[PDB]
Ligand binder design. Structure first.
Ligand SMILES: *[C@@H]1O[C@H](CO[C@H]2O[C@@H](C)[C@@H](O)[C@@H](O)[C@@H]2O)[C@@H](O[C@@H]2O[C@H](CO)[C@@H](O[C@@H]3O[C@H](CO[C@H]4O[C@H](CO)[C@@H](O)[C@H](O)[C@@H]4O[C@@H]4O[C@H](CO)[C@@H](O[C@@H]5O[C@H](CO)[C@H](O)[C@H](O)[C@H]5O)[C@H](O)[C@H]4NC(C)=O)[C@@H](O)[C@H](O[C@H]4O[C@H](CO)[C@@H](O)[C@H](O)[C@@H]4O[C@@H]4O[C@H](CO)[C@@H](O)[C@H](O)[C@H]4NC(C)=O)[C@@H]3O)[C@H](O)[C@H]2NC(C)=O)[C@H](O)[C@H]1NC(C)=O
Ligand SMILES: *[C@@H]1O[C@H](CO[C@H]2O[C@@H](C)[C@@H](O)[C@@H](O)[C@@H]2O)[C@@H](O[C@@H]2O[C@H](CO)[C@@H](O[C@@H]3O[C@H](CO[C@H]4O[C@H](CO)[C@@H](O)[C@H](O)[C@@H]4O[C@@H]4O[C@H](CO)[C@@H](O[C@@H]5O[C@H](CO)[C@H](O)[C@H](O)[C@H]5O)[C@H](O)[C@H]4NC(C)=O)[C@@H](O)[C@H](O[C@H]4O[C@H](CO)[C@@H](O)[C@H](O)[C@@H]4O[C@@H]4O[C@H](CO)[C@@H](O)[C@H](O)[C@H]4NC(C)=O)[C@@H]3O)[C@H](O)[C@H]2NC(C)=O)[C@H](O)[C@H]1NC(C)=O
Ligand SMILES: [Zn+2]
Ligand SMILES: [Zn+2]
Ligand SMILES: [Zn+2]
Ligand SMILES: [Zn+2]
Ligand SMILES: [Zn+2]
Ligand SMILES: [Zn+2]
Ligand SMILES: [Zn+2]
Ligand SMILES: [Zn+2]
Lengths: 209, 209
């Protein structure tokens, strides 16, 4: 003992696509083997909200409870900086334990997206790297994926975002393809999601030149 | 109470340059306000070693001691996977608390190093990105820097290493330069240090073409 509260954000990309339902999740742990009532109260910017889905408590293998409250936030609200208080009242807590969360703050910056060919040097090999530079973005929440005519591409990795000398973020995502696919003339396209982009999406294509 | 031991590695690049003196550092904390004797014993692969520099204990502002033992390791030994035991004997510890450390294990893989020009698209701007791809390396310990004819370059950032789909590591380092420097014909050079490279160094240059 005693109770600890953790409040978790939605996934970046559930926030970046209107077609998705982003949730903030409120988790309470160390609720006593003994005193098991827990109340949740939830607020958006101060106004109390009554829509959260609270689950029946689950007993952990360490003789302690754990209770969860999911609130669904609106695409517009989250992106618009609204603040989300989860307030947790136990009879084991002398003051309700509270926690607030919102999207990452700071002026939004729209990423520049660049696609880069394989070096003269890589062209020896039986596989090549296609490179997606994404720079000057802010905040760091981002999703990056590759696709080729319709279906997406397996063999890609993306770096975490890195903080740049101007307070902004950059990132590279590397697509690896069979050299035969690149020389054929197959179009490849790096798609980026970020809040600051129009409709939070853009896409840059790269082809054999 | 009671005592906790942390054993820290050298810096990657002190390990990658023969001209440098790499140290493993053994730190003991939570040594009691009361029982202040601490003994260190140190081993390389089992054989006890007698060369470590031990500092006089420093009292922390939380009413507790902290004592440090630095051992200097040899360039050859560290790279060669030797193991470094720091053994800590307090009278508050019913068994000596021990800790071992070595270089990251696994078969070494030599990085491929590629330099990449600015996209057709970036060339509009008054600053451009020069890109250094480093891929297929193992282990992840690496140092990457840019220089231009002699002195090094300020405005660069490098991503952390990322784990690739083949168990190896890649990384990109981005140099930003004034577009006037790039068009002049100024040579730029990405230098990489990694254990698997000949003499643990290589360097790839990039120029206006
Ligand atoms: C008794 O047992 C309890 C647990 O039961 C089991 O736990 C098992 C793992 C194992 O141990 C079993 O044997 C055991 O039976 C145990 O409870 C645990 O207590 C810990 C605290 O003591 C908690 O640790 C915290 O973890 C946080 C990270 O939590 C995520 O990651 C962990 C590790 O991987 C993971 O296990 C958790 O489940 C959790 O995962 C995330 O959960 C959320 C919500 O479900 C998801 O979010 C949603 O995802 C869904 C997916 O459908 C959907 O997409 C939604 O949209 C989205 O919202 C995540 O996706 C999900 N991810 C994963 C990977 O599953 C840490 O953040 C936290 O660190 C913070 O606090 C620490 C102090 O304790 C400290 O180290 C650190 O400083 C840090 O600080 C805070 O956080 C801020 C960071 O932003 C800081 O700014 C601040 O400093 C500070 N915040 C403030 C303001 O205070 C911490 O380590 C652990 O969660 C909890 N376990 C569970 C399962 O809840 C308990 O402790 C045991 N008791 C005893 C007596 O010891
Ligand atoms: C009383 O006060 C004590 C400290 O005094 C002051 O501390 C101040 C910061 C502040 O609090 C003051 O108010 C206070 O007065 C306090 O002591 C602290 O105890 C903590 C444990 O309870 C320790 O935390 C650990 O930290 C580790 C990281 O340590 C580095 O980073 C921290 C955070 O930045 C930094 O402060 C430390 O100084 C340390 O820095 C590094 O130090 C070494 C050696 O000096 C350097 O290495 C050398 O660099 C030199 C430079 O000249 C040269 O280049 C050499 O070649 C090179 O060797 C580093 O460069 C240097 N870096 C920096 C940034 O300075 C964490 O690793 C560790 O995490 C691990 O354990 C945790 C459990 O406690 C856990 O969270 C986690 O699971 C993790 O697990 C371990 O580690 C492995 C990771 O590889 C895992 O695999 C394993 O799970 C596990 N290992 C095993 C096998 O067990 C942990 O958090 C803290 O170091 C210590 N503070 C100091 C100053 O020593 C004390 O706790 C207080 N007591 C009470 C009653 O509370
Ligand atoms: Zn607030
Ligand atoms: Zn736009
Ligand atoms: Zn529109
Ligand atoms: Zn929107
Ligand atoms: Zn060992
Ligand atoms: Zn070689
Ligand atoms: Zn040689
Ligand atoms: Zn060497």
């Amino acid at each position: 003992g005693g109770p600890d509260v953790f409040l978790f954000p939605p996934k970046p990309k559930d926030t970046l696509m209107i077609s998705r339902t982003p949730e903030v999740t409120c988790v309470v742990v160390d609720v006593s083997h003994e005193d098991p009532e827990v109340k949740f109260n939830w607020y958006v910017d101060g106004v109390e909200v009554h829509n959260a889905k609270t689950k029946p408590r689950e007993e952990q293998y360490n003789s302690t409870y754990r209770v969860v409250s999911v609130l669904t936030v609106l695409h517009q609200d989250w992106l618009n900086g609204k603040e989300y208080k989860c307030k947790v009242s136990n009879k084991a807590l002398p003051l309700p334990e509270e926690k607030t969360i919102s999207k990452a703050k700071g002026q939004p910056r729209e990423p520049q997206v660049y696609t880069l060919p394989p070096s003269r040097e890589e062209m020896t090999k039986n596989q090549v790297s296609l490179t997606c530079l994404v720079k000057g973005f802010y905040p760091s929440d981002i999703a990056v994926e590759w696709e080729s005519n319709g279906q997406p591409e397996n063999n890609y990795k993306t770096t975490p975002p890195v903080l740049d000398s101007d307070g902004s973020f950059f990132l590279y995502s590397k697509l690896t393809v069979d050299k035969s696919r690149w020389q054929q003339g197959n179009v490849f396209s790096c798609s980026v999601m970020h809040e600051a982009l129009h409709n939070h999406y853009t896409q840059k294509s790269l082809s054999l030149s």
